[PDB]
JSON list of C-alpha atoms in Angstrom, two decimals:
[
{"chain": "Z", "resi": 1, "resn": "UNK", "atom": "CA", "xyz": [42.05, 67.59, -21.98]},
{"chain": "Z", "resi": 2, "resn": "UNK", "atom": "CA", "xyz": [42.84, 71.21, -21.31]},
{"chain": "Z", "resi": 3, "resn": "UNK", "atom": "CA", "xyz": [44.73, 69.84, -17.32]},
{"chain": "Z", "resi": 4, "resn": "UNK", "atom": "CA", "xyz": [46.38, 67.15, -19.25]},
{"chain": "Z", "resi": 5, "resn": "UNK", "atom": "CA", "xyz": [49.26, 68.26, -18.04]},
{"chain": "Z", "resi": 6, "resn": "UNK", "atom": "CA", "xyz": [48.19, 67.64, -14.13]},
{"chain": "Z", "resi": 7, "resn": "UNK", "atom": "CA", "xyz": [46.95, 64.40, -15.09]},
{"chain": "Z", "resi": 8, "resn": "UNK", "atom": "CA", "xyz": [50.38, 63.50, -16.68]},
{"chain": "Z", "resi": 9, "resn": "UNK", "atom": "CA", "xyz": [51.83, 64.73, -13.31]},
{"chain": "Z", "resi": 10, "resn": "UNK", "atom": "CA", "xyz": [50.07, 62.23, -11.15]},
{"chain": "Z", "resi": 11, "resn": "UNK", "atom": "CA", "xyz": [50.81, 59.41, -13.09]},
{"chain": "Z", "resi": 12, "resn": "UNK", "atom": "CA", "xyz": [54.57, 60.49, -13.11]},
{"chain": "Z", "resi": 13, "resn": "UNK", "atom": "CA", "xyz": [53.76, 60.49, -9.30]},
{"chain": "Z", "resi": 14, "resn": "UNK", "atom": "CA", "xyz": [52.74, 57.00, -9.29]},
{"chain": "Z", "resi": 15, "resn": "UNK", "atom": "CA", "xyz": [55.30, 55.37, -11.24]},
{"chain": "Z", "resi": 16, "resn": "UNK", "atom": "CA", "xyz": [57.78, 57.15, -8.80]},
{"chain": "Z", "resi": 17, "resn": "UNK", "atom": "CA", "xyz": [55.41, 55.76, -5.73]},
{"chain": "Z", "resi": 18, "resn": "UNK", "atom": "CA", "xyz": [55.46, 52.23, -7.37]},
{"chain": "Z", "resi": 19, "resn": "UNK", "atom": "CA", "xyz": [59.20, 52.47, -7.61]},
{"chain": "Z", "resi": 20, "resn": "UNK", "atom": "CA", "xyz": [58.57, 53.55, -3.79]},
{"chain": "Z", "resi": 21, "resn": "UNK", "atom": "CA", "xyz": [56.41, 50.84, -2.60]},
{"chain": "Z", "resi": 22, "resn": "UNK", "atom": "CA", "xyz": [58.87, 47.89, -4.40]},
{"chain": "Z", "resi": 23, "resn": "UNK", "atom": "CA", "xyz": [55.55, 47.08, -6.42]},
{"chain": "Z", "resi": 24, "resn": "UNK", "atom": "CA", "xyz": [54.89, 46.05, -10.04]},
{"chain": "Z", "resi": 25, "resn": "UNK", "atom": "CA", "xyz": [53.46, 48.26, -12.62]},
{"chain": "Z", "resi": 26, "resn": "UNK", "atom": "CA", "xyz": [52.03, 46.82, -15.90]},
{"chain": "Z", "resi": 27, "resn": "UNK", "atom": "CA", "xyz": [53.71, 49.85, -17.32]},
{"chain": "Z", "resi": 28, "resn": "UNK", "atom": "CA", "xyz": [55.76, 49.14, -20.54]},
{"chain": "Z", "resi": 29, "resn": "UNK", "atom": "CA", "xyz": [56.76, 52.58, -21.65]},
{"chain": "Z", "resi": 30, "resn": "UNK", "atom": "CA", "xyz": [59.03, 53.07, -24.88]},
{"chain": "Z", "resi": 31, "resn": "UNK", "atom": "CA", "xyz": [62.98, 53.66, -24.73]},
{"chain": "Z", "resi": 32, "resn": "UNK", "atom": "CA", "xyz": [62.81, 56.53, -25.52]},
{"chain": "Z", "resi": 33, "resn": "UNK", "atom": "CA", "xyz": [60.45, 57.75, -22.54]},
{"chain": "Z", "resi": 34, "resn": "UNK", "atom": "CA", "xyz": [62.45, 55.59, -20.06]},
{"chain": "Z", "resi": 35, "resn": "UNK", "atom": "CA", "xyz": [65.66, 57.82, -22.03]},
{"chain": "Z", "resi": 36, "resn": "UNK", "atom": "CA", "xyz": [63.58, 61.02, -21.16]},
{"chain": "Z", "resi": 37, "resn": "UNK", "atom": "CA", "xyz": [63.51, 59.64, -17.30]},
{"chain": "Z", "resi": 38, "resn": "UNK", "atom": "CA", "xyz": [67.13, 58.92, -16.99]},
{"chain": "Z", "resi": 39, "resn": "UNK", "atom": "CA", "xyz": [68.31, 62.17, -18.95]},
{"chain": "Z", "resi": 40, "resn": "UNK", "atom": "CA", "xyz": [69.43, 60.12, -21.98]},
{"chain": "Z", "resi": 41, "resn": "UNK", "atom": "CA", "xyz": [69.11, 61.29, -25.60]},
{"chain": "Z", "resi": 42, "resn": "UNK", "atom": "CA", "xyz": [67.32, 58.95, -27.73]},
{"chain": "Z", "resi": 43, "resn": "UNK", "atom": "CA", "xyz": [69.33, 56.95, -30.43]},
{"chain": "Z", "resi": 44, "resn": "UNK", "atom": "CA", "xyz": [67.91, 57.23, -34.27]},
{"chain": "Z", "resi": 45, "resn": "UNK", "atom": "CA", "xyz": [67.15, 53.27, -33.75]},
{"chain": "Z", "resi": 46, "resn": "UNK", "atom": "CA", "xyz": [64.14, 53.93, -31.50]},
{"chain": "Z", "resi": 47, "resn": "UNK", "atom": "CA", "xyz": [62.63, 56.23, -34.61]},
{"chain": "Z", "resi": 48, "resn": "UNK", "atom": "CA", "xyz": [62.14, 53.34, -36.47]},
{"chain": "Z", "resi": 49, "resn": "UNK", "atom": "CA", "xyz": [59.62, 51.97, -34.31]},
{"chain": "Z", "resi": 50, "resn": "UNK", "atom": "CA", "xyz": [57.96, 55.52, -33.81]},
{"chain": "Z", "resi": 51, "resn": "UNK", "atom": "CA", "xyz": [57.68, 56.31, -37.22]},
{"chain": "Z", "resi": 52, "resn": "UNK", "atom": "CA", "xyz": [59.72, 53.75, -39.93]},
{"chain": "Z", "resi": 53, "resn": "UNK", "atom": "CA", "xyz": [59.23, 56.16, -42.61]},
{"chain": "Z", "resi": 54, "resn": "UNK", "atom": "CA", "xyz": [60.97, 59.11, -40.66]},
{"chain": "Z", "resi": 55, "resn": "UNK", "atom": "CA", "xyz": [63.60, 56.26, -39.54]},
{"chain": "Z", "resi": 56, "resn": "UNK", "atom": "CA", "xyz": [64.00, 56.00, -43.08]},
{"chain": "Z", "resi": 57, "resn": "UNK", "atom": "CA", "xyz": [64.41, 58.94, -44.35]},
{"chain": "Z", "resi": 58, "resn": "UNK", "atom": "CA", "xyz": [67.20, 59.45, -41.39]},
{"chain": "Z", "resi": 59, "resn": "UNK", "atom": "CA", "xyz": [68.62, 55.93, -42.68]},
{"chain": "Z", "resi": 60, "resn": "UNK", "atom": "CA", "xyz": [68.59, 57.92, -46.50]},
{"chain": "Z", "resi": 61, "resn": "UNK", "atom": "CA", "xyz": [70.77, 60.32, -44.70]},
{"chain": "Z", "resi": 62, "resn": "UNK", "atom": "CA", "xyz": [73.39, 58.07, -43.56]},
{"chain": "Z", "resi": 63, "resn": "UNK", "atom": "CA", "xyz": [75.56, 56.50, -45.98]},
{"chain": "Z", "resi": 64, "resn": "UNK", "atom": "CA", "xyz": [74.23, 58.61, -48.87]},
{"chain": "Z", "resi": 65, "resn": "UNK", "atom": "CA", "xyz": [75.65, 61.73, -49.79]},
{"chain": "Z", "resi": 66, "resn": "UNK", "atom": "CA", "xyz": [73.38, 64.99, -49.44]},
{"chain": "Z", "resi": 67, "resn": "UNK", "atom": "CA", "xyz": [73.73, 65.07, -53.46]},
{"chain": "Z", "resi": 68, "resn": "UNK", "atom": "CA", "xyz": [71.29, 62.40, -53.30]},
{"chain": "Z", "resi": 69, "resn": "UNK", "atom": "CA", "xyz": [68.55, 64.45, -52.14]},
{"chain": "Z", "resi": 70, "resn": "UNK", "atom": "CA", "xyz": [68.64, 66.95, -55.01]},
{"chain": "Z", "resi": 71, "resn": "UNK", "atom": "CA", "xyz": [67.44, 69.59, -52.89]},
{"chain": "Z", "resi": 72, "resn": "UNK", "atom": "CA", "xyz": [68.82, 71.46, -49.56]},
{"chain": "Z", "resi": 73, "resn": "UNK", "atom": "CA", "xyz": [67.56, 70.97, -45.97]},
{"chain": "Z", "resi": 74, "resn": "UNK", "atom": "CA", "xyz": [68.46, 73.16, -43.40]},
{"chain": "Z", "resi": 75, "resn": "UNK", "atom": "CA", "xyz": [67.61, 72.21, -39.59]},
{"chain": "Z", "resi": 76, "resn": "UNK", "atom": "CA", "xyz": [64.10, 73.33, -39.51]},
{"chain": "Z", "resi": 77, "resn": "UNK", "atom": "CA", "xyz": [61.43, 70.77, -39.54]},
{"chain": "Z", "resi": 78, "resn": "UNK", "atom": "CA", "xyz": [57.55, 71.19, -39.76]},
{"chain": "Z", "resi": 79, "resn": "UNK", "atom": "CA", "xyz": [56.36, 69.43, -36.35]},
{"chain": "Z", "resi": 80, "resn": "UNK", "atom": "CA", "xyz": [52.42, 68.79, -35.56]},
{"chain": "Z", "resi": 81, "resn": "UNK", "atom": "CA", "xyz": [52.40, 69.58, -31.61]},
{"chain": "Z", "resi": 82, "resn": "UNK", "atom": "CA", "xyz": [48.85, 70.23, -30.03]},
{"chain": "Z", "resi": 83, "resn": "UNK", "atom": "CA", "xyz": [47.27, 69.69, -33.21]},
{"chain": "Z", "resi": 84, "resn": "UNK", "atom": "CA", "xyz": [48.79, 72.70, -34.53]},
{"chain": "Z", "resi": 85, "resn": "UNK", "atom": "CA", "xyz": [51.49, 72.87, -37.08]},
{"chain": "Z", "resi": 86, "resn": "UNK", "atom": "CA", "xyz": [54.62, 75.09, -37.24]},
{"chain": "Z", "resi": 87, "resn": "UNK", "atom": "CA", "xyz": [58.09, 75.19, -38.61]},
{"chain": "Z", "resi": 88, "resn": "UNK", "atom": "CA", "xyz": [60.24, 74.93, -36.09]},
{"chain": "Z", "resi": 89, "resn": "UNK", "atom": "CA", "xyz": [64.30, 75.08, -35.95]},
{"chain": "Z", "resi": 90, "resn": "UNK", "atom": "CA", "xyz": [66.33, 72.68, -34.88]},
{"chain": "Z", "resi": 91, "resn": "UNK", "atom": "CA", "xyz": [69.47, 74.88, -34.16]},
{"chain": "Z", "resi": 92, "resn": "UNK", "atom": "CA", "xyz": [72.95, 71.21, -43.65]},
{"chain": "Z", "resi": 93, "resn": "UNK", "atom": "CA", "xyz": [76.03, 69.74, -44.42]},
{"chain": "Z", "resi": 94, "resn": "UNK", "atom": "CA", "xyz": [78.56, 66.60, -44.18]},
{"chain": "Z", "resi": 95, "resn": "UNK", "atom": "CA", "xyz": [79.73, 67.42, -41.02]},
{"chain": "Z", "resi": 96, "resn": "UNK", "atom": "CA", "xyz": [75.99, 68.80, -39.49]},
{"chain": "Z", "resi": 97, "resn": "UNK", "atom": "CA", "xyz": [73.85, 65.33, -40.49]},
{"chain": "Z", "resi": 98, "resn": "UNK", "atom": "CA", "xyz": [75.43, 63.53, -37.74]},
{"chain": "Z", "resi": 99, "resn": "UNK", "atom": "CA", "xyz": [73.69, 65.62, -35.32]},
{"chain": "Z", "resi": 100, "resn": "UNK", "atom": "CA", "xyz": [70.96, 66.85, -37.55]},
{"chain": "Z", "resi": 101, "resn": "UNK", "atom": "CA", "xyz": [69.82, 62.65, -37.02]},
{"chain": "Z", "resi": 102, "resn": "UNK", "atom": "CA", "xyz": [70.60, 62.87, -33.46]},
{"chain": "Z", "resi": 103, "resn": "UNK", "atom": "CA", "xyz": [68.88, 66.43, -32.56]},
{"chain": "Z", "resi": 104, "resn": "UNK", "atom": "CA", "xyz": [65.71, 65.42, -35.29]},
{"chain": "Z", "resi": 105, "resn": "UNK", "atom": "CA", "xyz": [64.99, 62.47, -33.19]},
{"chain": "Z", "resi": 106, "resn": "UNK", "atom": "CA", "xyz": [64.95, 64.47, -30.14]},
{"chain": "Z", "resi": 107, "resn": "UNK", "atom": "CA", "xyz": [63.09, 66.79, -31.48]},
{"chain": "Z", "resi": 108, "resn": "UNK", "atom": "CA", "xyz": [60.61, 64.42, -33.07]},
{"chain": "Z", "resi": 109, "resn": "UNK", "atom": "CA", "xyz": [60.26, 62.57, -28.91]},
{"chain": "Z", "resi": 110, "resn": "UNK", "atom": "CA", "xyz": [59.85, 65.62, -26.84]},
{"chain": "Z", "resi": 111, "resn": "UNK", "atom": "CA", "xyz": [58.38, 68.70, -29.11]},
{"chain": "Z", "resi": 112, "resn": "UNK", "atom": "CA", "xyz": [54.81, 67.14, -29.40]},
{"chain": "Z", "resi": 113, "resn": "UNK", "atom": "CA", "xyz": [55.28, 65.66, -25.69]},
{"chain": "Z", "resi": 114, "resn": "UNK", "atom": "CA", "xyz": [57.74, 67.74, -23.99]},
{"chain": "Z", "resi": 115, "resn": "UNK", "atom": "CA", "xyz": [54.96, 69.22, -21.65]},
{"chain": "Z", "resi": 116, "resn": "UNK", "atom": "CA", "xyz": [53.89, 66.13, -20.81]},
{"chain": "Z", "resi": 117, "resn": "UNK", "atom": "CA", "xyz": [56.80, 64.85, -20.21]},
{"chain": "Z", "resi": 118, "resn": "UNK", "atom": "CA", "xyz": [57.83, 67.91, -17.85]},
{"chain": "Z", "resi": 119, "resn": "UNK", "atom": "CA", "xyz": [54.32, 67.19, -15.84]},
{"chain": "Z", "resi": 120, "resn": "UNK", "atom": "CA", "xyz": [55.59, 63.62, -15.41]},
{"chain": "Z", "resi": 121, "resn": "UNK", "atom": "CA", "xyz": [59.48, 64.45, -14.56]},
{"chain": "Z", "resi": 122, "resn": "UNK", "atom": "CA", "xyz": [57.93, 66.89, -12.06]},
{"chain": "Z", "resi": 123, "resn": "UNK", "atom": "CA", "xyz": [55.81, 64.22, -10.72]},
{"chain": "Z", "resi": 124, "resn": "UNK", "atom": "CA", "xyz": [58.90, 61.75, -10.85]},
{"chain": "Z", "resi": 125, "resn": "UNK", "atom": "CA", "xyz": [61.56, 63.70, -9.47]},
{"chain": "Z", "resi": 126, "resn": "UNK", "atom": "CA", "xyz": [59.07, 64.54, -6.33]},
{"chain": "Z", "resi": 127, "resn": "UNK", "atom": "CA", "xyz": [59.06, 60.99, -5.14]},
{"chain": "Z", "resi": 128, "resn": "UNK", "atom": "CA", "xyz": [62.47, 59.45, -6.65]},
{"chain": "Z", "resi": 129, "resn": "UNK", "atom": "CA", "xyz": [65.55, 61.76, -6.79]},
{"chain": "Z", "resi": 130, "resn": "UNK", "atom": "CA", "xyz": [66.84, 61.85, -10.23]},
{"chain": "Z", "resi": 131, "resn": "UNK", "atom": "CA", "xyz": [70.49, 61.38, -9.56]}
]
């Protein structure tokens, strides 16, 4: 849809005039959105429901040394967005991994969505202030 973006405005628009109106949505949005709403970074736990094998591979991460990989990642990460496909950075090492999990599950949430998502926060932060 080429005005998806509007359309993802107006709904964030009427969750914020459902939270307005004291009335019920059937809405059951993920953590990680709800995270996006409150300004909260996402935890590597919610990956595993978005995509176990990713949460995996971020689980292969932790409590393994990067020796077990047997070759080097850096924090660049090939991300489908739009339907096209680029390499994009992310900014590895012992003391990089622990955010390397942390900033690939962000990027993973928001780079295929983070329009979206600013459409919606728009339409959110027009009705309920953020703060």
């Amino acid at each position: 849809n080429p005005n998806h973006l509007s359309y993802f405005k107006f709904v964030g628009r009427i969750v914020a005039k459902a939270v307005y109106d004291n009335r019920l949505l059937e809405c059951y949005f993920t953590r990680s959105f709800y995270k996006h709403i409150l300004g909260k970074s996402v935890r590597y736990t919610d990956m595993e429901s978005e995509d176990y094998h990713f949460y995996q591979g971020l689980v292969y991460l932790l409590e393994n040394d990067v020796s077990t990989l047997g070759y080097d990642l850096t924090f660049s990460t090939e991300v489908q967005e739009f339907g096209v496909c680029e390499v994009r950075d992310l900014k590895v090492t012992e003391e990089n991994k622990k955010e390397y999990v942390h900033l690939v599950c962000q990027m993973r949430m928001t780079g295929a969505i983070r329009k979206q998502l600013a459409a919606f926060l728009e339409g959110f932060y027009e009705i309920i202030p953020k703060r």
